[PDB]
Amino acid sequence: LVQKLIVYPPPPTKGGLGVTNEDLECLEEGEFLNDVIIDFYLKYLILEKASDELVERSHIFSSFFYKCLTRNLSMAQRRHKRVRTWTRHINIFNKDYIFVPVNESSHWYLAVICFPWLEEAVYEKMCKRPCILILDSLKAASVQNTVQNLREYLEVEWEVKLKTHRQFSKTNMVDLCPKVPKQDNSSDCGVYLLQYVESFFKDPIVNFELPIHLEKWFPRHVIKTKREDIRELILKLHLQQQKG
Amino acid sequence: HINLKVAGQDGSVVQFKIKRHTPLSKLMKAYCERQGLSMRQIRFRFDGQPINETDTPAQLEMEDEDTIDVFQQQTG
């Protein structure tokens, strides 16, 4: 008998995500995180941990956005049509950071589209660049394909919403892989994805000179207790939601 | 009455007729049944957002020929 521990955010708020005791099973050591835990915690970060400036300049896609994208018109237009309504009330070209959780071949990693309204690097004396950051706790073979799919999503989203032709290429939106803390086992990819987003909100990347050193982005103890911390957070929210 | 599309991961699309104020619960159950899975295994999303059994097309402000996306569980 599966029963829902929490709905986050809880009603009356629309768009709440159900988390069941079965979803809590994936937080035990050695288990692969599932999409419910990822999507829950990323919504928790934006609703409770992100600064108010970061919320306004950021957008976090559902973990199904990239899977849906890659499930007359060109092939790029055909992919975009599948997710065209997922930005119904969002102008991603007015955001600084667009977060895309990627699950390819049972491995989580994170793409971050940065300053898509810029057309070239600018220094004022920090360096901000239009680019796609790949934040990966292991190594994913599909990275170049992901980056090209995201450039092609941006081109079609731009043409559809801004109604001019704008190219997004390697020279215009370079792909970068910051040096981030890496995994030591075979099952914590999803926990690192969540930690990368958490640490980005606490300490956003604002200098894009390479290499981007993030080796000390967060301490070791926070990642070693994250599974338990997330589980304890869900249990605390469960008791709160029992009261109302 | 409006028509809604349910688009699955295998490229298929299934059409449903539903009244603007009927909760989505029975369309979702009919969909899980007709393709053989449980509610606990299928994620329903509209414009990329979670959809709950309580919600009605009116409250989600759906229009005729809108699409609900369905996904199976993801792990990594």
Domain extent listing, chain A: 1-57+178-244, 58-177
The whole-angstrom separation of Cα A155 and Cα A150 is: 9
Q: Which class is domain B2-72? A: alpha beta
In the numeric block, the tokens 């690192």 are attached to: A192
Return all residues near B62 (Cβ < 8 A) that are at least 6 apart.
B2, B4, B20, B46
Domain ranges of chain B: 2-72
In the numeric block, the tokens 């004396």 are attached to: A125
DSSP per-residue letters across A122-179 = EE---EE--EEEEE-SS--TTHHHHHHHHHHHHHHHHHHHH-S-----TTTSEEE--B
> What residues of A are annotated to the active site?
107, 136, 189
Return the H-helix or E-strand segment holding A5: strand A4-8
Nearest residue on chain B to A105, judged by CA atoms? B76
Two structure tokens written together for B3: 């028509």
DSSP A48: I
Angle subtended by helix axes A189-202 and A226-243, to nearest 10: 80
Any chain A CB within 8 A of the CB of B12? no
Which phi and psi (to 5°) does residue A228 adopt?
-65, -40
Residue among A54, A56, A53, A24 at smallest CA distance from A37: A24
Contact (CB, 8 A) for A79 and A152: yes
Residue among A152, A157, A51, A150 at smallest CA distance from A110: A150
Sign, CA torsion A25/B41/A186/A111: negative
Residue A194 with chain B: CB contacts under 8 Å: none
Longest dimension (CA), chain A: 58
Q: Do A16 and B48 touch (CB under 8 A)?
A: no
The whole-angstrom separation of Cα B74 and Cα A109 is: 13
Any chain A CB within 8 A of the CB of B59? yes
The whole-angstrom separation of Cα A30 and Cα B75 is: 12
Neighbours of A8 (CB within 10 A): 22
User: B59 vs chain A: nearest CA distance in angstroms?
Assistant: 9
Resolution (in Å) of the shown entry?
A: 1.7
Residue among A172, A167, A169, A157 at smallest CA distance from A79: A157
User: B25 vs chain A: nearest CA distance in angstroms?
Assistant: 15
The whole-angstrom separation of Cα A98 and Cα A37 is: 20
